[PDB]
Design a protein around this ligand. Structure first.
Ligand SMILES: NC(=O)c1ccc[n+]([C@@H]2O[C@H](COP(=O)([O-])OP(=O)(O)OC[C@H]3O[C@@H](n4cnc5c(N)ncnc54)[C@H](O)[C@@H]3O)[C@@H](O)[C@H]2O)c1
Ligand SMILES: NC(=O)c1ccc[n+]([C@@H]2O[C@H](COP(=O)([O-])OP(=O)(O)OC[C@H]3O[C@@H](n4cnc5c(N)ncnc54)[C@H](O)[C@@H]3O)[C@@H](O)[C@H]2O)c1
Ligand SMILES: [Tb+3]
Ligand SMILES: [Tb+3]
Lengths: 322, 322
C-alpha cells in the first residue's frame, strides 16, 4: 500500500483556474446541502520563532474527501530563504482511515482563495458587469484577477493600492489577460467598478460607504483574522451578504465589525453555497452584494484532491510506501 | 529540501520497549516542567463508516519536535481486512514550518501507550511488586505486558478478561517473558496483584472498590472516551490519582465518573510527569495509586521523532520531495 505525494513545484504546471473553480464551486454546494463540514480549527502560537501553527480539517461526504491542512506562518523565515507561509495538505481514505496523499498547500491556498471569489462573481455579479475593481496589489492579487477574468468577461480593470509602489503588479496582470488597466483612486473605484475584489492586510475601513455607487458586487477576501478590516461598516450594512462559514464571518470575517455594533443581523448572513445549490435567490433585487470570504479547510481539501488526480494522470504523483 | 517517510513495516525493526520508554519518560518530564504541551484535541464523528477522526497536535520546545497524529477508529475496517485503529504522525520543522517526516502510527500508538503505563509503574508501583495483574486481553494487552516486564521484574502474571477466550494472548506473551500465568477472577486479582494494568474498551465498572486490597498501583489505560468506564468510582475516590493531561482525565479519562459524582475535584488529580521531574514525591504512604492514561499527542510525537532518527541511521527513511 502506497500513498501519493505531489511536490510543491508541480502545482503550477497541473492546476488551472478552471480546475480550481470546479473544485471550489462544488465544495460550496456540498456545504450548503450539509454534505460537508469543517472541523474546529486549531490555531496555536507555539512560542518559538514567533510561529503560528495549526490545523484546518474537514470532511466532504459528497466527494469523499477527508483530511486537513497543517502549517501556518513563520515570520522569521527570511533567514532560511523561505516564504513566511508554510502549509501542507494531508488526505485520508474515508473508507479505511489510511493516509492517501500529501500535497504542499502554499500555492493551493492562493488558488482556492482566488477560486472562491470567482464563484461569488459567477453567482452575484451585476448583469453585464463592465469594469473589475481591484483593491490591493499584493501577491494574491495576481491570482484574484486571473480567476476573475476566467469566469467573467470584463472590459476594463481599475485598481487602487494602499501602497502605491506595487501598483505595477496589477497592470502586468491586466496586460497579461488582454485587458486595459488604469490606476484610479478609491473614490472613483467604487463608482465605476461593477465587481470589486479587495485582498489587503488592512486594519481600517478602506472602501467607504459613499464610494460605492450603483449595482456592485464586492468580494471581501482580505479580512480573515480578528482585528482586520477593509470595508466601512456602513457599507456592509446596506448590502446583501453571503459567506463560506457564517460562524467565521461574524467572528474573524469582514462582518465581525457590523455584527458587533448591531448594524447587521447574524441570521441575514447568507451562504454563497446556497446560491450555487439553487436554494438561495442570490443577488435578487439588492443593489450591493458582499461575499465575505474567510477561508475554510474544505476549500483546501477540494483543490488538493483535484491536484492528486491531475498529478497521477500526468505522471508526477510520487508513489511512497507507508 | 525534502520530506522523510517511514513506512509502517519498518517500525518493528526500529523501535524497542526501552527506546519507547526513554522517549515517553522524557516527555512526561517536559510536560511537568512546562517545556512542552499538547494542542486542543480535535475528535469528530464524521458520519461515514461510523468513523472517529481527529488530530492530536503538540510542541516540545525542549526537543524541538512539532507536529500531530491524524486518524482514528474505523469500526467496520474488518471488511477491508484492516485493523480498526488507523493513525499517522506528521512531523514539522519548528524553525521553518515545513513538513519534515511522515511515520506510520499504528504500532507507534501501542508502543507509547505501553511506555506510558511502564513509566507510571517505575515511579508509582509498590516497593517490591511481585505480581502483575492484567485486566484485558485485547491487541494492546501484549504490548502492556512486555513494557511492564521490561521496567520492573515480576514473578507472576495473573489475568482477567470479559471474554475469557482471549486470555491465551496473555499466557502466550507471559511465556515469551519467562513468567508464569494464571487466569483469575477480579476478586483475586485485586487482592493479589501489586501492579494492575487495565486496557479494556468497557462502559461498566469492572474492578470494584472492595476488590483492591493492600498496596496496589492501577494503570488505567482503557478509558479514553466520554462514556467509557473501567473502575469503580469509589475505588478512584480513595486513590492518589495521577494522569498525563488533567483536562482530559476529568472529561474523557477514568476520572470522568468520580468527577461527575462529586467524589473528587480536578485539583485532586495529579500529574505523573511531576513525579518524573522530581517535583512530586509520588506514592508516599498511599495504599492505592492510579495513573489515568488517556493518551496525548506528545507521546506520539516523541516516539515518532526517535523512529525517524533510527530510520536515517538504518537507511530505511524514504526521502521524498515536497
Ligand atoms: N480569505 C482567505 O481565504 C484568504 C487566503 C489567503 C490570504 N488572505 C488574506 O489576504 C490578505 C492579503 O494577502 P497577501 O498575502 O496578498 O498579503 P500581501 O501583504 O502580499 O499584500 C498586502 C496588502 O495589504 C496592504 N496593506 C499592508 N499593510 C496595510 C495597512 N496597515 N493598512 C492597509 N492596507 C495595508 C498592502 O498595501 C497590500 O495591498 C491577508 O490579509 C491574508 O490574510 C485571505
Ligand atoms: N489510553 C491510551 O493511551 C490508549 C491508547 C490506545 C488505545 N486505548 C484504549 O485501549 C482500549 C483497548 O485497546 P484494544 O485496541 O486493545 O481494544 P481491543 O478491542 O483489542 O480489546 C478490547 C478488550 O476490551 C474488552 N471489551 C470489549 N467489549 C467490552 C464490553 N462491552 N464490556 C467490557 N469489556 C469489553 C475485551 O476484553 C476486549 O479484549 C480501547 O478502549 C482503546 O481506546 C488507550
Ligand atoms: Tb452504522
Ligand atoms: Tb472462538
Amino acid at each position: 500500500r502506497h500513498m501519493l505525494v505531489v511536490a510543491e513545484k508541480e502545482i503550477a504546471g497541473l492546476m488551472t483556474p478552471e480546475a480550481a473553480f470546479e473544485a471550489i464551486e462544488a465544495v460550496f454546494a456540498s456545504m450548503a446541502r450539509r454534505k460537508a463540514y469543517n472541523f474546529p480549527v486549531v490555531r496555536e502560537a507555539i512560542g518559538h520563532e514567533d510561529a503560528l501553527y495549526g490545523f484546518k480539517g474537514g470532511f466532504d461526504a459528497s466527494a469523499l474527501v477527508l483530511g486537513l491542512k497543517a502549517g501556518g506562518y513563520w515570520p522569521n523565515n527570511q533567514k532560511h530563504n523561505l516564504i513566511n507561509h508554510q502549509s501542507t495538505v494531508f488526505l485520508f481514505d474515508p473508507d479505511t482511515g489510511r493516509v492517501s496523499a500529501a500535497v504542499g498547500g502554499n500555492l493551493l491556498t492562493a488558488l482556492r482563495t482566488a477560486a472562491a471569489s470567482a464563484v461569488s462573481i459567477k453567482y452575484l455579479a451585476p448583469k453585464g458587469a463592465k469594469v473589475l475593481g481591484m483593491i490591493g496589489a499584493g501577491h494574491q492579487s495576481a491570482f484574484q484577477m486571473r480567476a476573475a477574468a476566467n469566469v467573467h468577461r470584463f472590459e476594463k480593470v481599475i485598481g487602487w493600492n494602499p501602497h502605491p509602489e506595487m501598483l505595477s503588479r496589477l497592470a502586468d496582470t491586466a496586460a497579461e489577460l488582454g485587458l486595459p488597466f488604469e490606476a484610479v483612486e478609491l473614490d472613483r473605484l467604487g463608482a465605476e467598478a461593477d465587481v470589486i475584489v479587495s485582498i489587503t492586510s488592512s486594519f481600517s475601513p478602506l472602501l467607504m460607504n459613499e464610494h460605492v455607487k450603483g449595482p456592485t458586487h464586492i468580494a471581501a477576501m482580505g479580512t480573515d483574522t480578528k482585528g482586520k478590516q477593509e470595508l466601512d461598516p456602513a457599507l456592509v450594512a446596506r448590502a446583501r451578504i453571503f459567506t463560506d462559514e457564517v460562524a467565521q464571518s461574524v467572528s474573524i470575517g469582514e462582518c465581525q465589525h457590523a455584527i458587533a455594533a448591531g448594524l447587521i443581523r447574524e441570521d441575514q448572513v447568507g451562504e454563497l453555497g446556497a446560491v450555487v445549490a439553487g436554494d438561495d435567490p442570490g443577488r435578487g433585487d439588492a443593489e450591493v452584494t458582499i461575499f465575505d470570504g474567510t477561508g475554510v479547510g474544505l476549500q483546501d481539501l477540494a483543490v488538493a484532491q483535484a491536484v492528486v488526480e491531475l498529478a497521477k494522470h500526468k505522471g508526477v504523483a510520487q508513489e511512497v510506501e507507508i
